[PDB]
């Protein structure tokens with residue numbers, strides 16, 4: 001239970017689950033500026049689940065906290081871009097965020113516990 005490296009496969013499996021959710025489809029790829037011409041006026045740092053998966057598989061996350069910051073940026077971008085808090089795509093983002101936070105909590109707890117055990121003495 002003190003495996004320092006276990007978070008990585010746990011996050012690969014959670015991303016697989018997110019890619020099976022219909023609620024993820026708007027968040028799997030970048031925004032087309034012909035469809036949303038003002039998107040980059042509002043959003044300084046775009047983020048999507050394909051970018052998160054590629055960053056993970058490249059070995060360019062050091063911890064699950066860093067992955068969690070990028071996933072949370074997908075959801076804050078949707079809340080900043082939405083013209084209404086009842087919109088279809090924003091409503092999908094809130095359900096997907098609740099599912100992600102329910103599943104990532106044990107991944108973060110186990111990782112932090114494992115590093116504390118590594119430094120115990």
Ligand SMILES: C#CCNC(=O)N1CCN(C(=O)c2ccco2)CC1
Pocket residue numbers: 025026027028029030031032035036077078079081082083087089090
């Ligand atoms: C697949 C794919 C391409 N995604 C895409 O076009 N969008 C996702 C991001 N976005 C929003 O979060 C949002 C909130 C309210 C309306 O859109 C704009 C639309």
